[PDB]
Amino acid sequence: NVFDFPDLNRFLTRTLQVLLPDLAAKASPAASALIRTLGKQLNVNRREILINNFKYIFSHLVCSCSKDELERALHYLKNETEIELGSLLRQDFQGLHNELLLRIGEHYQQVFNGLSILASFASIISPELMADYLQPKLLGILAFFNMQLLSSSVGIEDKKMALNSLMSLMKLMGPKHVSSVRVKMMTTLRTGLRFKDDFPELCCRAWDCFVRCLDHACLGSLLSHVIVALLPLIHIQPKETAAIFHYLIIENRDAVQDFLHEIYFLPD
């Protein structure tokens, strides 16, 4: 009522997406009773609601919890859902990894541990091994990030967090994975530009990564759209856009032999 949600059950619908993770983080018998109460109010079973919100549940768990408490809550949730937690996580093949890569910008190391537990159940802390275990999901993960940037349900602060997470993810992917996913990465960076009305330098750093950290050879087939998109960012502010353009032009000039002349649109 203080928030004036349309329906109290709609307020519960919105709030649960984050409350269920904290309810599991408490892992108390009172928490189980409260989950049953919510399922009654939402007219759903206490076992299925947990399996459904397990994405955000495990996400917040790996985001903030202790390993012993993590295992405690895992066993508690398995018993409450009446199914093996490993099987549920298997049923959550990509949705969980999505939220993990969304929370990486907040807790790099915590989500590194979570992905290590993501890979242990998927069958592991080496960064290259982690990237290779995540290299398959990339396109789908990029699509999830893009949809998150697109959704009106998430705030602009959540969008900035997702952008930072995407920056860290592009850093972790390495030049091979980045070069492989360049097209979808460029689509998602265009989405970031579409949202860059308020977080300009954030998207600018994202582009600095997608340019400098990106492959050095195959720059120009993509440098076309890179300049086309960065055109709006320069007008907002030129501080880092100038350095981005310099790295694109000056540094990779030899590998920008023809694509340089191909790009005749340039601001002042």
Swiss-Prot record:
Q: What is this protein called?
A: Serine/threonine-protein kinase ATR
User: What is the annotated localization of this protein?
Assistant: Nucleus; Chromosome; Nucleus envelope
Q: According to its UniProt record, which protein family does this protein belong to?
A: Belongs to the PI3/PI4-kinase family. ATM subfamily.
Q: What is the documented function of this protein? A: Serine/threonine protein kinase which activates checkpoint signaling upon genotoxic stresses such as ionizing radiation (IR), ultraviolet light (UV), or DNA replication stalling, thereby acting as a DNA damage sensor. Recognizes the substrate consensus sequence [ST]-Q. Phosphorylates BRCA1, CHEK1, MCM2, RAD17, RBBP8, RPA2, SMC1 and p53/TP53, which collectively inhibit DNA replication and mitosis and promote DNA repair, recombination and apoptosis. Phosphorylates 'Ser-139' of histone variant H2AX at sites of DNA damage, thereby regulating DNA damage response mechanism.
- What gene does this protein come from? ATR
Specify the domain of life of the species encoding this protein. Eukaryota
The UniProt subunit note reads as follows: Forms a heterodimer with ATRIP, forming the ATR-ATRIP complex. Present in a complex containing ATRIP and RPA-coated single-stranded DNA. Binds to DNA, and to UV-damaged DNA with higher affinity. Interacts with MSH2 and HDAC2. Present in a complex containing CHD4 and HDAC2. Interacts with EEF1E1, the interaction is enhanced by UV irradiation. Interacts with CLSPN and CEP164. Interacts with TELO2 and TTI1. Interacts with BCR-ABL after genotoxic stress. Interacts with UHRF2; this interaction promotes ATR activation.
Post-translational changes noted in the entry: Phosphorylated.
**What disease is linked with this protein in Swiss-Prot or TrEMBL?**
Seckel syndrome 1: A rare autosomal recessive disorder characterized by proportionate dwarfism of prenatal onset associated with low birth weight, growth retardation, severe microcephaly with a bird-headed like appearance, and intellectual disability.
Q: Which residues of the full protein are shown?
A: 980 to 1257 of 2644
Q: In which tissues is it expressed?
A: Ubiquitous, with highest expression in testis.
